[PDB]
Design a protein around this ligand. Structure first.
Ligand SMILES: Nc1ncnc2c1ncn2[C@@H]1O[C@@H]2COP(=O)(O)O[C@H]2[C@H]1O
Ligand SMILES: Nc1ncnc2c1ncn2[C@@H]1O[C@@H]2COP(=O)(O)O[C@H]2[C@H]1O
Ligand SMILES: Nc1ncnc2c1ncn2[C@@H]1O[C@@H]2COP(=O)(O)O[C@H]2[C@H]1O
Ligand SMILES: Nc1ncnc2c1ncn2[C@@H]1O[C@@H]2COP(=O)(O)O[C@H]2[C@H]1O
Lengths: 202, 202, 202, 202
């Protein structure tokens, strides 16, 4: 009941802050809808709880919680069980509401995303659209190239994503260099299909 | 009512600290006057509240709260809506009392400022004074040049400013290089009018 | 009684988190067994308590708490009392349950370990096993070489270890360069006995 | 009364921690004697309180609290009022008990000290002793040279010092390069009187 009580306290604090800034009741509604989807009436201090454990127990728990997600991801079917673990322990859960732009083309990228549930549209400057759904990943090209985002990515439904920051990305890939080659190969093919080629991926 | 209660608790804690250090009742008055203007009886944990949201919702809220400020700023009238967003999310509100020196000439600079409400005087070593008011910015030349502050800046009224740190400055400007050129052009003209030229701005 | 009360509060919070994630009662049992061995019904905020002290008092306390551990370690019998102090203040206590792999061969290493109580097995890719017990250390070769772990290390009993991170390691060894030579000599001999030679240790 | 209550709570927490580690009643006495001299029955959260203020108010308060200390220090009599301010805002108060070694010869140095109240002995390897008292500073040579401590420094009475870390030191001295020359000159003379010369001070 501490987890529920903490949800209630933090939400009330948001309500107060929204009241103070005189936000539209319709936008407050949007915030509430976000809290409901993202937290579902509960807040745990995950990092604090896992911080009390040792390494193996931390990795056991996360592997356990992320079983359905891992089953769904081609990246991981075939991959080393320990690469899968090194990624999982670095993931941040995030939720987006339909219509929200997750990534805008042309900006500097600082994270990658894995789709657990939802549909996203990858939109090029030139108006071509490709859909990505459960088990796919996007946002990695910028991280490989140290360049800019090559396309926009817009939630077409509620999306439940896990993000991975550029430092955690580069770290896991120092440890698993074969997996860098796997990401670059897909990146090259994805770029080709949108009229692009970057030779730093070769 | 948590926001008010937190103001009261933190103020009382300051009172205690001032009592302990036996500060003059007139200087305590000055502190109280500062708390009143800066907080207006409320303390929110903004960073904690916004930390619970996703990116788009964070940016929506800030864009919303900063509408009057943005309207007032020539820097932003004409500028990309997304450059404006990248700056806004990095701003720290600060208040100064009349007579306070915000910037002293000759020192190393670590932040820039945007005026929301108030009058400042830009004072040269040679005694020339230029006034800056709502919608203007100062403190940027040092950040561009990696040199020292080229003039002093003194609050002539209560000022309500937003500051931007040198790291956030350089970060936004990596992402929007055209805006670096816009800052340098104004910087060159401002320097010329005070007898200065620095070739690292060309 | 604050220390006990804090154990109870934090454990209850873990229970809640495990209930939420619907973890097997047998794995929850494993977690509880871990809490019991690691904390023994108490949680102190060590870093906060020691943070209030000065340097000498901090070092006195730690030297005192770690007397049995220091007696048991050949590394330290003969070593400078001040090298021993510089290491001790940087140690993190950790507990492992029988069967847990502390180190997997082939991965990047970020810490070293000192055994206070327990038996570990050092396992090579080629299936050779060497046991290490109270007073020994493992996990240092990777830190010296900036390479990868040269063997796996598996707890064969409950182990009570103290870890030392790669930054604290390199820091103490900048201050005591003779002790780097002592670690490298043992490292060279340990590698030789497992079919390995790395010339960056010479 | 929050400040007193916080002293009581934190002390009780130390008592508990000492009871747990079965520390000698005589060493517990030493800890209590330290708390009494260092805190005098009160704990303020200084950094949190000053964090709520603007720059000028922060600097006013510290200048005010440190008036007796500043009067006593030759380094500062004559120095720019703004160099004095830049140092003061970076100082950490610390207390040492008679007999404690503040600095051991031969180690890497990470801070400097200013004496507010007390007597210290500067002891060379060769057994020569020089006393330093209110208004003096020690611990700076290592910071200038990036070398090792050139002498030991032992509290001969209770000492009330303010420390300045190597980063804050180098930072203030980037901003006031004339003051680096002032420190180096005294450093050269101090070294000469103990049989030493380091050419990186020229
Ligand atoms: N042809 C494609 N098919 C699917 N996804 C793509 C394609 N091209 C780009 N993307 C994604 O759009 C993302 C936009 O950000 P990034 O460039 O970092 O990474 C990009 C890809 O992950
Ligand atoms: N001619 C000018 N007109 C208006 N403002 C100025 C002028 N010259 C300098 N300033 C401001 O004074 C500031 C002092 O700090 P900075 O050099 O960092 O940046 C400087 C400018 O932003
Ligand atoms: N021959 C050996 N005898 C005992 N321990 C060893 C031997 N070889 C390797 N180890 C330990 O196994 C550890 C695995 O990680 P590291 O390479 O970092 O350091 C290694 C050693 O500390
Ligand atoms: N001749 C001297 N007189 C007074 N103090 C000294 C003398 N020589 C060294 N010290 C102090 O002893 C300190 C030991 O640490 P540091 O070398 O960092 O700096 C040294 C000086 O500040």
């Amino acid at each position: 009941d501490s987890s529920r009580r903490q949800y209630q306290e933090k939400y009330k604090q948001v309500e107060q802050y929204m009241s103070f800034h005189k936000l539209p009741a319709d936008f407050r509604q949007k915030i509430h809808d976000y809290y409901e989807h993202r937290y579902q009436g509960k807040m745990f201090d995950e990092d604090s709880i896992l911080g009390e454990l040792n390494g193996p127990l931390r990795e056991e728990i996360v592997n356990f919680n992320c079983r359905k997600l891992v089953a769904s991801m081609p990246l991981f079917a075939n991959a080393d069980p320990n690469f899968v673990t090194a990624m999982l322990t670095k993931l941040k859960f995030e939720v987006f509401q339909p219509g929200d732009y997750i990534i805008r083309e042309g900006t500097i990228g600082k994270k990658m995303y894995f789709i657990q549930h939802g549909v996203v549209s990858v939109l090029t400057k030139g108006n071509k659209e490709m859909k990505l759904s459960d088990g796919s990943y996007f946002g990695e090209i910028c991280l490989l190239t140290r360049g800019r985002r090559t396309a926009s990515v817009r939630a077409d439904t509620y999306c439940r994503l896990y993000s991975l920051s550029v430092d955690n990305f580069n770290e896991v890939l120092e440890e698993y260099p074969m997996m860098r080659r796997a990401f670059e190969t897909v990146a090259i093919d994805r770029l080709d299909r949108i009229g692009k080629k970057n030779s730093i991926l070769l």
